[PDB]
Amino acid sequence: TSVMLNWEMELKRWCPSFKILTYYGAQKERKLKRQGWTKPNAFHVCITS
DNA sequence: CAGGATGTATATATGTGACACGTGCCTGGAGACTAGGGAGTAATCCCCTTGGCGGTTAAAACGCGGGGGACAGCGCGTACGTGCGTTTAAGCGGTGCTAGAGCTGTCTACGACCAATTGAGCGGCCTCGGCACCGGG
């Protein structure tokens, strides 16, 4: 959990073309983020703890 | 703010229903006295199912606002109560009759009971698939 932001920033820095999805927050926020996440090309790289 | 006009008590009385009280019967009970059985109390002790630690989010809670529901006032209508008269079958108790609940006597098939044998059921274990969970329409 301490390096999720670090990984996200490194991805945004080096490879700007990846759709990054940081899976964090309360349950309700996690459900909101999961809503429609099964669709194709919704995100390219997911970062979780 | 009275008073006929009812209705509801209150008190007394008596004699016929019913508690109340002998008189003896006895047969079903109630207890005493030996002998035999037996299941649960008591002490350990192995083993699960409680009661006790720290987090996570989900539900309880607090507030707000207005909206629809409770409760009170009021009035219209009709039906439900009360009284009077007519009607009916309900209460009484008197007689007649027999049907079967009950007591009784005899004979008997069914079940408790006891011993040996057998497999139906149940704890246990594992593999698996019906539905819990979930995110898009």
UniProtKB/Swiss-Prot annotation:
Q: Which domain of life is it from?
A: Eukaryota
Give the disulfide map: none
Q: Where in the cell is it found?
A: Nucleus
Q: Which disease is it linked to?
A: Floating-Harbor syndrome: A rare genetic disorder characterized by proportionate short stature, delayed bone age, delayed speech development, and typical facial features. The face is triangular with deep-set eyes, long eyelashes, bulbous nose, wide columella, short philtrum, and thin lips.
Q: How does it assemble?
A: Interacts with CREBBP and EP300. May be part of a complex containing SRCAP, CREBBP, CARM1 and GRIP1. Component of the chromatin-remodeling SRCAP complex composed of at least SRCAP, DMAP1, RUVBL1, RUVBL2, ACTL6A, YEATS4, VPS72, ACTR6 and ZNHIT1. Component of a NuA4-related complex which contains EP400, TRRAP/PAF400, SRCAP, BRD8/SMAP, EPC1, DMAP1/DNMAP1, RUVBL1/TIP49, RUVBL2, actin, ACTL6A/BAF53A, VPS72 and YEATS4/GAS41.
Similarity section: Belongs to the SNF2/RAD54 helicase family. SWR1 subfamily.
User: What does this gene product do?
Assistant: Catalytic component of the SRCAP complex which mediates the ATP-dependent exchange of histone H2AZ/H2B dimers for nucleosomal H2A/H2B, leading to transcriptional regulation of selected genes by chromatin remodeling. Acts as a coactivator for CREB-mediated transcription, steroid receptor-mediated transcription, and Notch-mediated transcription.
Q: Which protein is depicted?
A: Helicase SRCAP
List the source organism: Homo sapiens
Quick one: which gene encodes this? SRCAP
From-to range in the entire protein, with total length = 676 to 724 of 3230
